[PDB]
């Protein structure tokens, strides 16, 4: 948590006006009025990393929901677990009227 | 004594010089910051001369026919970069070379 908080601090202390000179703008003969088609490439990466670091708990929650809902059905969806005599015997024992 | 500490970076030395240049014209009043600033300047100039002499001795006594292998140099460059920008170097990256 300390490492993650430090990284988020560093990301948030960046400037907003964070254009990037791409060295391929040579072939795009910019005339001081046009807009470079790659000014926002480091800004987009900074935003992506920051937001992904801020949505960590949401990913954790969805992951644990997926894991729980796929584990609860192990004995019904996985063949070598569903076909052992012990799991079959237990599932039969539950249904004894 | 007072013993103003050694400047950590070059900006600190620049601000030391600025402070000295501001203080100069009131020596009978300050009389104590000037001496510490000048001792620091003496130490810095001494270190610079020693560094120049050691660099001269180093560059003229390197080796006759030694060379650096490219693989190791590339690994060292990448590791230096990673360590410089606070990322992590995997454990199998330096012990094995």
């Amino acid at each position: 948590s300390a490492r993650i908080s430090n990284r988020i601090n560093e990301l948030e202390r960046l400037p907003a006006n964070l254009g990037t000179y791409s060295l391929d703008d040579c072939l795009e003969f910019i005339t001081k009025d046009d807009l470079s088609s790659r000014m926002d490439t480091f800004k987009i990466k900074a935003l992506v990393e920051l937001k992904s670091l801020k949505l960590l708990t949401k990913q954790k929650s969805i992951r644990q929901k997926l894991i729980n809902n796929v584990a609860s059905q192990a004995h019904h969806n996985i063949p070598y677990l569903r076909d052992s005599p012990f799991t079959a015997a237990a599932q039969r024992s539950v249904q004894i009227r | 004594e007072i013993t103003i500490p050694k400047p950590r970076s070059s900006a600190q030395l620049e601000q030391l010089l600025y402070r000295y240049r501001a203080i100069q014209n009131h020596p009978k009043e300050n009389k104590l910051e000037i001496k510490a600033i000048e001792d620091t300047f003496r130490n810095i100039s001494r270190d610079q001369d020693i560094y120049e002499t050691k660099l001269d001795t180093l560059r003229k006594s390197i080796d006759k026919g030694f060379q650096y292998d490219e693989d190791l140099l590339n690994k060292h460059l990448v590791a230096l970069q990673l360590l410089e920008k606070d990322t992590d170097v995997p454990d199998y990256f330096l012990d094995l070379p």
Binding site: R3, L55 | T87
Partner: peptide
């Protein structure tokens, strides 16, 4: 599938 946290988990352990 997004390696959001892998670097820090790896460097701490």
């Amino acid at each position: 599938s997004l390696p959001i946290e892998d670097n820090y988990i790896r460097e701490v352990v």
